[PDB]
Design a protein around this ligand. Structure first.
Ligand SMILES: Nc1ncnc2c1ncn2[C@@H]1O[C@H](COP(=O)(O)OP(=O)(O)OP(=O)(O)O)[C@@H](O)[C@H]1O
Ligand SMILES: [Mg+2]
Length: 599
């Protein structure tokens, strides 16, 4: 009944609701306001999401998935995906359509299903707080996400059983959260979002013209594979090389050692944001027949800064590009808003302050603002939030491949959305049966250097001289940033059937199958939980009966006492197994014969 806003981050996910006019973040079952984006599949069949999954990471590395957002919407042969293939403990494979999928327990799974598991946990948290079913949600994506990644995120939302009312850019959500309390003074802001895996920069104007707060995204830019994971990778590489120099062992050959080192590097990087120096201590990191080996290496803040300065500087150029696109300068930015945990690093804050010449505001929560803005967006869609208007832009220039492999723009970057373009297309061959259009996204002048959306084939063209048929093709960009291509004959008005080929993404049948699979996974998790509860009850009953035997057993007649010695073992026989109902039946017979010892 109530639309919830979900920040679906690479490392941490958050959920918020509109409690009347007040946005409110909800805490998960563990008590945390944010949920780590870690999904674990147990052999028992329990699906673990968040902190518990992280706890089991050391014991189930192959079936524990994380950083799935870095794979969503990407093809397997991408350089980033190929780099991640040799690093992630879980198996990354190519799908039948060439997209990057994961392999868990011998089953191929698309990243949308895995993200849908986290979305299901957030949905369950929202329902537990509200006590009513939730079927509608607003889901966040990085501003610089291309069409394929946005579509895959919407598919993940659908698989989780949520009607995705709106896909909202994370900097836009932060802008909504900030504009809720201080959007009234006609202020231009720069939202600098640096999360676990993605970086975005948005120049956004906020004005109170005639009593309605309007948020207009003047410009946007970023990098979808730049984030705290790369900082951790730099630190891990330094630590591995130093350990190999000190002890001669390359830890890259030990997956468990690499997992522990990833955890230690994450903790050290976080601690260096407050401390000037930390010590990475990983005792018993590995063991040879000579004995255990221990890692103990000092890391100063200067060392980490020297290791990640180039990444921080890589984040700076999109600021210049966005400022040029907006037609403004650093003096024309009234407020600087930092978003994301990685901005807590003092080097990032110093670099941003030096770039803009002014210190960023301290009144914005970097971990919760995105979910608050998503909840605000949901409230706007229902009318619960009034006097608020939004005008976002397309992050990438849409174009087509023309003669010579050159890119031909149809919709420029930073064009406000929703938007509609129409262009006339015709045949290049006599009596041509079909006309193909290669559609791509990117700013590069060469078609081969842009993200291909695919070949759209207008097929079934009646024979005619080349250039005679006149097909108007319309490219629509909805409020989600997703492209929809349509075609109609401008002479007759009849629609032309478009067949998409060589595109990335999931089809409808796959999505339905994955929804059913998600339901099956939920039922398997409940069965595993019921079994766990049954084992706890059985152990409690066994201990209680032993206590009763110790206190009163000797007074009890020998016949029942001697019989129950093995009768309790009969209950144990089922208790050691994977039986839920028979454990209860044996528990019932044991309790009925222990009744005399109960009272
Ligand atoms: N105090 C800190 N100092 C340094 N790094 C930090 C700090 N706190 C968090 N991080 C890092 O920031 C990242 C988490 O940021 P956040 O939770 O905003 O990412 P996310 O939203 O999941 O990622 P993204 O938005 O890119 O998808 C992690 O890599 C984490 O190690
Ligand atoms: Mg984030």
């Amino acid at each position: 009944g109530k639309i919830i806003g979900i920040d679906l981050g690479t490392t941490n996910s958050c959920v918020a609701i509109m409690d009347g006019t007040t946005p409110r973040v909800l805490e998960n079952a563990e008590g945390d306001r944010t949920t780590p984006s870690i999904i674990a599949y147990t052999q028992d069949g329990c699906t673990l999401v968040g902190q518990p999954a992280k706890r089991q990471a050391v014991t189930n590395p192959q079936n524990t998935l994380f950083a799935i957002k870095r794979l969503i919407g990407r093809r397997f042969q991408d350089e980033e995906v190929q780099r991640d293939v040799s690093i992630m403990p879980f198996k990354i494979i190519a799908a039948d359509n060439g997209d990057a999928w994961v392999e868990v327990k011998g089953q191929k799974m698309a990243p949308p299903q895995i993200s849908a598991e986290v979305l299901k946990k957030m949905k369950k948290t929202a329902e537990d707080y509200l006590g009513e079913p939730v079927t509608e949600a607003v889901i966040t994506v990085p501003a610089y996400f291309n069409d394929a990644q946005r579509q895959a995120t919407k598919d993940a939302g659908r698989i989780a059983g949520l009607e995705v009312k709106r896909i909202i850019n994370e900097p836009t959500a932060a802008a909504l959260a900030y504009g809720l309390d201080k959007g009234t003074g006609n202020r231009t802001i720069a939202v600098y979002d640096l999360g676990g895996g993605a970086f975005d920069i948005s120049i956004i104007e906020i004005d109170e013209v005639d009593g309605e707060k309007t948020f207009e995204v003047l410009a946007t830019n970023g990098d979808t594979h730049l984030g705290g994971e790369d900082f951790d990778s730099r630190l891990i590489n330094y630590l591995v090389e130093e350990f190999k120099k000190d002890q001669g062992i390359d830890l890259r050959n030990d997956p468990l050692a690499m997992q522990r080192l990833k955890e230690a590097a994450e903790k050290a990087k976080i601690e260096l944001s407050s401390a000037q120096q930390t010590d990475v201590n990983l005792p018993y990191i590995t063991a040879d027949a000579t004995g255990p080996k221990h890692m103990n290496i000092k890391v100063t803040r200067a060392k980490l800064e020297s290791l990640v300065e180039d990444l921080v500087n890589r984040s700076i150029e999109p600021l210049k590009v966005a400022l040029q696109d907006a037609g403004l300068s650093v003096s024309d930015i009234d407020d600087v808003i930092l978003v994301g945990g990685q901005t807590r690093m003092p080097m990032v804050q110093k670099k941003v302050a030096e770039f803009f010449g002014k210190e960023p505001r301290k009144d914005v929560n970097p971990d919760e603002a995105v979910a608050i803005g998503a909840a605000v967006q949901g409230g706007v869609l229902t009318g619960d939030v009034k006097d608020v208007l939004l005008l976002d832009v397309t992050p990438l220039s849409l174009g087509i491949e023309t003669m010579g492999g050159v890119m031909t723009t149809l919709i420029a970057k930073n064009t406000t959305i929703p938007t509609k373009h129409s262009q006339v297309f015709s045949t290049a061959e006599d009596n041509q049966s079909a006309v193909t259009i290669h559609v791509l996204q990117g700013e590069r002048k060469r078609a081969a250097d842009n993200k291909s959306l695919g070949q759209f084939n207008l097929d079934g063209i009646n024979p005619a001289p080349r250039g005679m048929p006149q097909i108007e093709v319309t490219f629509d960009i909805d409020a989600d940033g997703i492209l929809h291509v349509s075609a109609k004959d401008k002479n007759s008005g009849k629609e032309q059937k478009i067949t998409i080929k060589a595109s990335s993404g999931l089809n409808e049948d796959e999505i339905q199958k994955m929804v059913r699979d998600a339901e099956a996974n939920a039922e398997a998790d409940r069965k595993c939980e019921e079994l766990v509860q049954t084992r706890n009850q059985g152990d409690h009953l066994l201990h209680s009966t032993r206590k009763q035997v110790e206190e009163a057993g000797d007074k009890l007649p020998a016949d029942d006492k001697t019989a129950i010695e093995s009768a309790l073992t009969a209950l144990e026989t089922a208790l050691k197994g994977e039986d839920k109902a028979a454990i209860e039946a044996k528990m019932q017979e044991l309790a009925q014969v222990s009744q005399k010892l109960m009272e």
